[PDB]
Amino acid sequence: AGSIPGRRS
Amino acid sequence: AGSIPGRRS
Amino acid sequence: AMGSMERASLIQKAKLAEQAERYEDMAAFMKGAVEKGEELSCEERNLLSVAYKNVVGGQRAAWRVLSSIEQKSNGPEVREYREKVETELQGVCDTVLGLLDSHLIKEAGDAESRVFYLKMKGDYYRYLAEVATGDDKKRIIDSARSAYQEAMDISKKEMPPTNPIRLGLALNFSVFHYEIANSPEEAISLAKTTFDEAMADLHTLSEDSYKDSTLIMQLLRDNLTLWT
Amino acid sequence: AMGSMERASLIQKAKLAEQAERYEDMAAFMKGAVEKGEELSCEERNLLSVAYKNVVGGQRAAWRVLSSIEQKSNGPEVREYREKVETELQGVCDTVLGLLDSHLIKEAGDAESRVFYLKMKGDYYRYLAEVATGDDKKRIIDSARSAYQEAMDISKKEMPPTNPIRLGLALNFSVFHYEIANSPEEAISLAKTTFDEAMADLHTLSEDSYKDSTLIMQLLRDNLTLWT
Numbered sequence A, B: 001a002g003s004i005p006g007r008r009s
Numbered sequence C, D: 001a002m003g004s005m006e007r008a009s010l011i012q013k014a015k016l017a018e019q020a021e022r023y024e025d026m027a028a029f030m031k032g033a034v035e036k037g038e039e040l041s042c043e044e045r046n047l048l049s050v051a052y053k054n055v056v057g058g059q060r061a062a063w064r065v066l067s068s069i070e071q072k073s074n075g076p077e078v079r080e081y082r083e084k085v086e087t088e089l090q091g092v093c094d095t096v097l098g099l100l101d102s103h104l105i106k107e108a109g110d111a112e113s114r115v116f117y118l119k120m121k122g123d124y125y126r127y128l129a130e131v132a133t134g135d136d137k138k139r140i141i142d143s144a145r146s147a148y149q150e151a152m153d154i155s156k157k158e159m160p161p162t163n164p165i166r167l168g169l170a171l172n173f174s175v176f177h178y179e180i181a182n183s184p185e186e187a188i189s190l191a192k193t194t195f196d197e198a199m200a201d202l203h204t205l206s207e208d209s210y211k212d213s214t215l216i217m218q219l220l221r222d223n224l225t226l227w228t
C-alpha cells in the first residue's frame, strides 16, 4: 500500500 | 480571473 | 524529432500521454503531428491545445511563485532562476506561435478552425505579455489584441452566440482586457454582452449543447462576480 | 552540467524549485550539489530525496496507467510508449543509485546518514523491481532486499524505535515484502512489531518528536488495516 509519501520537504 | 481552463480534452 | 513516426501513431500517443498526465510528451507528439503538414481535425486541434495549455500552465504557475519571492527580496539566485523559468516559458509560447504561423492559420478556412487558431494566437501572446517588461511589451500586447480581435470578428459573423469556441474566445479576450490591457470596463462589458446574447440563444440547443454552452457562461458569470 | 554553479546556489535553487513545484529542476540542482563531492547535511539529504521521489513518482504513476491500458489491449503504440516511460524511469533510478554509489554511501559514517542512504538504495531498487520482467528481476529484488536489510540492522543497533528514519525504513521494507517479495506475512509482522516498539518508546519524546513519530506510525497502521 503506502510507502512514505516523501514528496514535501 | 479565470480564462478557459483548457487542460482536459 | 518526430519525423519518423506516423501521423496516426503520434495522435494515438498524444491521447495516451494525456491519460498518463505526461503533458510535455503530449505536446511533443502533437507538435510532430502538426509538422506532418496536414490540417488538423476538431479533435486534433483540441489535443494540441490541451497539451500546450498544461505545459505553459505549469510554467506560468512556477513563474508566479518565483516572481513573488523575487519581489519580496527587493544573492542573484532568485532572479536567475525566475529568468530561467521565464525563458523556458517564452520558448514554449514561441513554439506554439510558430506552429500557428507555419502553417496552421494560413490553411484554416472554416470558421471553427480559423477562430480556434486565432484564439490560440491571442492566448500565447497574452502569456508572453504576462512576463514582458522590455521595449516590446507594448508590441506583444498589440499582437495579442489583434489576434483576438480578428477571431472575434469572424466569430460574430459565422457562429451563433452559444458556440463554445465563440464563448471561450470572448471569455479569454475579456481576461486580456482586465489583466493585460488595463481595461476592466471593456472586460466587464464584453463578458456581460457575451453572457446575455448566449442566454437568449440557449432555446435553440439540444440538451448536450446546452450543457456545453452553460458551462462556459458560468465562467463568464464567475469573472463578472469577481470584477463587480 | 551544474559544474559551474556554486554548491550553495544549487541548494538555494533546489529550495526555490520545490516551492515552484519544479521537481525535475530540483533533482538536477541536487544532483549538481552531490557532484560537488562534499557530504550532505540532514536538510540537504531531505532535499535530494524529495526531488527524486517526485520525479520518479510521476513516472511510476504514468507507467501504471500505460501498463493497465496495455494489459487491456492484450498496433505497437501502447507498448512502445509504455517502454519509453519505463526506460526514462529506469534512467532516473540508475542516476539516483549512481549518486549513492559515487560516493554518498561510502562516505556516510553516522547512523542517520548511512541508514538514510541505504533506505534510498532499497527504494530505488524497489522501483526498478516494479517494472522488471527479464532475467535480472530476481537480482534487482535481491539488491533492494540487501540494502533494506543493512539499513535495518544499523537502525536497530543505533536508533531508538521512534526515530522517524527508522520508522520510514521499516514502513518501506514492509511494503517491499508485501508488494515485491510476495511475503505478506513478513510485511504484516514487520509493520506490527515496528508499531508496537515505537508505541512503547513514545513516552521519551517531546511534543514535536511525538508528532513526527506518530505520523509515521499511523501509516504503518493504515497498511496493517489494508492488509488484514
Ligand SMILES: *Cc1ccc([N+](=O)[O-])c(OC(=O)c2cccc(Cl)c2)c1
Pocket (backbone or CB within 6 Å): A004, A005, A006, A007, A008, A009, D049, D050, D119, D164, D165, D167, D168, D169, D212, D216
Ligand atoms: C523515508 C522517510 C521517513 C520519515 C519521514 N518523515 O516525514 O519523518 C520522511 O519524510 C518525508 O520525506 C515525507 C514524509 C511524508 C510525506 C511527505 Cl510529502 C514527505 C521520509
Ligand SMILES: *Cc1ccc([N+](=O)[O-])c(OC(=O)c2cccc(Cl)c2)c1
Pocket (backbone or CB within 6 Å): B004, B005, B006, B007, B008, B009, C049, C050, C119, C164, C165, C167, C168, C169, C212, C216
Ligand atoms: C478555448 C475553449 C473554449 C471552449 C471550450 N469548451 O470546454 O467548450 C474549451 O475546452 C477546453 O479545452 C477546456 C475547457 C474547460 C476545462 C478544461 Cl480542463 C478544458 C476551450
Ligand SMILES: [Ca+2]
Pocket (backbone or CB within 6 Å): C006, C007
Ligand atoms: Ca505516413
Ligand SMILES: [Ca+2]
Pocket (backbone or CB within 6 Å): D006, D007
Ligand atoms: Ca565553490
Ligand SMILES: [Cl-]
Pocket (backbone or CB within 6 Å): C039, C107, C108, C109, C110
Ligand atoms: Cl483549409
Ligand SMILES: [Cl-]
Pocket (backbone or CB within 6 Å): D039, D107, D108, D109, D110
Ligand atoms: Cl563521513
